[PDB]
Amino acid sequence: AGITGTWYNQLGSTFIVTAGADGALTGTYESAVGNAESRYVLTGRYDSAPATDGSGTALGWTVAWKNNYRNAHSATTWSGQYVGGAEARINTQWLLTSGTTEANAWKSTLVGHDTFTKVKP
Amino acid sequence: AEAGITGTWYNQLGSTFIVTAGADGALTGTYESAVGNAESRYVLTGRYDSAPATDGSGTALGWTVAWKNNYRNAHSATTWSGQYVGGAEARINTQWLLTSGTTEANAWKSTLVGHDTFTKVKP
Amino acid sequence: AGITGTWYNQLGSTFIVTAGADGALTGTYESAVGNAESRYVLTGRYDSAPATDGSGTALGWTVAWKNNYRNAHSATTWSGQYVGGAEARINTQWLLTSGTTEANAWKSTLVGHDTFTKVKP
Amino acid sequence: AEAGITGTWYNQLGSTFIVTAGADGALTGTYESAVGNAESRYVLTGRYDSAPATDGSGTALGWTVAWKNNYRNAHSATTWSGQYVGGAEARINTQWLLTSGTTEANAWKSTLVGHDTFTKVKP
Numbered sequence: 001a002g003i004t005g006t007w008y009n010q011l012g013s014t015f016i017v018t019a020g021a022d023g024a025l026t027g028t029y030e031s032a033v034g035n036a037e038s039r040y041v042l043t044g045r046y047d048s049a050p051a052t053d054g055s056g057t058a059l060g061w062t063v064a065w066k067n068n069y070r071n072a073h074s075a076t077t078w079s080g081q082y083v084g085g086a087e088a089r090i091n092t093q094w095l096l097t098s099g100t101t102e103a104n105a106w107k108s109t110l111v112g113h114d115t116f117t118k119v120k121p
Numbered sequence: 122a123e124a125g126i127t128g129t130w131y132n133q134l135g136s137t138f139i140v141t142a143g144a145d146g147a148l149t150g151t152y153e154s155a156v157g158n159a160e161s162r163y164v165l166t167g168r169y170d171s172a173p174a175t176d177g178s179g180t181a182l183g184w185t186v187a188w189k190n191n192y193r194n195a196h197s198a199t200t201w202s203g204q205y206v207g208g209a210e211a212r213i214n215t216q217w218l219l220t221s222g223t224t225e226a227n228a229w230k231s232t233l234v235g236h237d238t239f240t241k242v243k244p
Numbered sequence: 245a246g247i248t249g250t251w252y253n254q255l256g257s258t259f260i261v262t263a264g265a266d267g268a269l270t271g272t273y274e275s276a277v278g279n280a281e282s283r284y285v286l287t288g289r290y291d292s293a294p295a296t297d298g299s300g301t302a303l304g305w306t307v308a309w310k311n312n313y314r315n316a317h318s319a320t321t322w323s324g325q326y327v328g329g330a331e332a333r334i335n336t337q338w339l340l341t342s343g344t345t346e347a348n349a350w351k352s353t354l355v356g357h358d359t360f361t362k363v364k365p
Numbered sequence: 366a367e368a369g370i371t372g373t374w375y376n377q378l379g380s381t382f383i384v385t386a387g388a389d390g391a392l393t394g395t396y397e398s399a400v401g402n403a404e405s406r407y408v409l410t411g412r413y414d415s416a417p418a419t420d421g422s423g424t425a426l427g428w429t430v431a432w433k434n435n436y437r438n439a440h441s442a443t444t445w446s447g448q449y450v451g452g453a454e455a456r457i458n459t460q461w462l463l464t465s466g467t468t469e470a471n472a473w474k475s476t477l478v479g480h481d482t483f484t485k486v487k488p
């Protein structure tokens with residue numbers, strides 16, 4: 001529906017997702033930055049029964065940076081909300097964790113925020 | 122990847138995390154929280170590195186849970202991001218972001234941040 | 245210098261700061277949202293000797309939401325960087341912690357991001 | 366506010382946090398980290414609620430440290446945000462954001478996030 005489609009964030013990354021009736025999110029992610037290449041599988045969940053007011057729809061998805069081409073031994077999870085309308089938007093904040101030794105654990109997680117704009121005409 | 126990830130885990134709050142790890146990187150299972158606007162199990166989905174590095178690094182992973190089942194809907198979603206550490210006392214160290222569906226006016230206070238540690242030992 | 249002055253974020257909040265030679269930041273903050281009113285004291289620290297390349301200047305500051313008018317029993321810390329030039333900017337990500345009982349501790353911290361634009365002509 | 370905040374604290378990493386709490390809400394002291402690009406003490410400044418609620422809520426506080434002294438400059442700053450809990454075994458539970466000075470091209474990977482727990486007991 002509103003979430004299903006093709007999106008892009010401020011970095012130029014590509015986000016193609018499909019929203020299922022049971023609240024499931026599946027698709028592929030293509031990052032424009034970092035030790036990444038081509039498409040990576042993504043999986044998430046969303047509130048399939050949001051508030052009818054002016055509230056956004058809570059959702060989230062994960063991407064392990066490993067495919068048949070590269071492995072950055074890391075995973076990112078995006079958490080945010082879908083805001084519908086003429087100009088659909090997905091505002092997120094993310095956590096990127098890397099696999100590290102017990103000694104380097106304190107510096108294993110980066111935090112950021114991505115804003116997605118919908119395309120798919 | 123000798124993933125001992127599969128199994129039933131518990132966090133410091135007493136929440137029950139049940140997961141199965143697929144050979145290709147998929148994570149699936151149910152989540153039951155001991156705190157907050159929730160009851161019974163909620164479906165969760167995630168991904169993990171099905172080929173961690175040879176050194177002694179943990180296995181990166183993450184998963185999400187929209188807080189809605191047949192009993193309630195807290196109009197929220199939580200994503201956990203972290204790493205699995207195998208061994209005698211296996212553990213999953215994570216940090217999470219909980220986003221609530223809100224109006225544009227309240228978007229600034231829509232996301233909580235925390236951290237949970239899961240072990241295979243009772244709450 | 246570059247940091248010293250008056251700033252505003254996307255929410256309409258007011259940030260008046262002075263950068264000291266020893267890396268100290270002092271000033272007042274006025275929030276446009278939340279259980280807040282008037283001016284609150286702020287204190288921070290910044291990298292007083294940044295890289296001469298195109299890097300930003302690392303900095304941070306804290307505000308306890310308590311003054312002679314209100315007390316929201318909370319404190320926010322902003323962490324980010326100052327990016328100079330014609331259009332000065334301060335990109336931050338913040339953590340807002342509230343005082344809570346041990347039972348409600350898991351939901352004591354909100355996270356967000358504020359972008360500041362400089363004014364003081 | 367019976368602030369037992371003042372004193373020397375240590376975190377799970379072995380870092381030493383020394384602070385003095387002013388009657389009006391100010392926090393000042395030095396910070397020494399056992400990990401990372403750092404050595405010796407670094408000046409820190411912060412604020413805390415000098416009038417917490419009457420119930421059993423913790424005392425909200427926060428502080429910053431730019432990582433530059435006479436020995437090194439890691440071109441970074443860390444802010445800790447959390448709450449003080451008094452009692453037999455006093456503790457300061459916090460979460461932090463570490464921002465590195467970077468170019469616009471690397472801004473997306475400039476901030477690390479974690480959490481530290483400070484107690485008055487040796488490392």
Ligand SMILES: O=C(CCCC[C@@H]1SC[C@@H]2NC(=O)N[C@@H]21)Nc1ccc([N+](=O)[O-])cc1
Nearest residue numbers: 011013031033034035036065072074076098
């Ligand atoms: O490079 C890797 C994998 C690609 C990460 C892309 C990130 S996901 C959040 C943000 N949104 C995007 O669309 N793209 C970026 N990961 C990685 C990064 C840093 C470190 N590190 O140690 O700093 C280790 C692995």
Ligand SMILES: O=C(CCCC[C@@H]1SC[C@@H]2NC(=O)N[C@@H]21)Nc1ccc([N+](=O)[O-])cc1
Nearest residue numbers: 134136154156157158159188195197199221
């Ligand atoms: O209560 C709800 C749903 C359940 C959330 C459980 C959280 S998931 C992170 C942490 N780890 C656990 O095992 N359990 C907790 N969500 C919610 C919470 C707060 C707000 N709020 O506005 O503050 C809105 C919705």
Ligand SMILES: O=C(CCCC[C@@H]1SC[C@@H]2NC(=O)N[C@@H]21)Nc1ccc([N+](=O)[O-])cc1
Nearest residue numbers: 255257275277278279280309316318320342
């Ligand atoms: O309302 C209060 C105090 C004012 C907070 C202003 C925040 S600081 C980050 C952001 N940037 C701004 O310029 N303004 C906002 N705090 C508070 C908020 C929420 C809760 N809560 O429980 O949800 C408790 C206390």
Ligand SMILES: O=C(CCCC[C@@H]1SC[C@@H]2NC(=O)N[C@@H]21)Nc1ccc([N+](=O)[O-])cc1
Nearest residue numbers: 378380398400401402403432439441443465
């Ligand atoms: O090494 C530096 C300076 C020292 C940082 C100490 C951190 S403060 C949070 C945590 N709590 C502690 O007590 N100690 C650690 N900073 C730095 C670290 C990583 C990167 N990086 O790019 O990954 C850049 C600068």
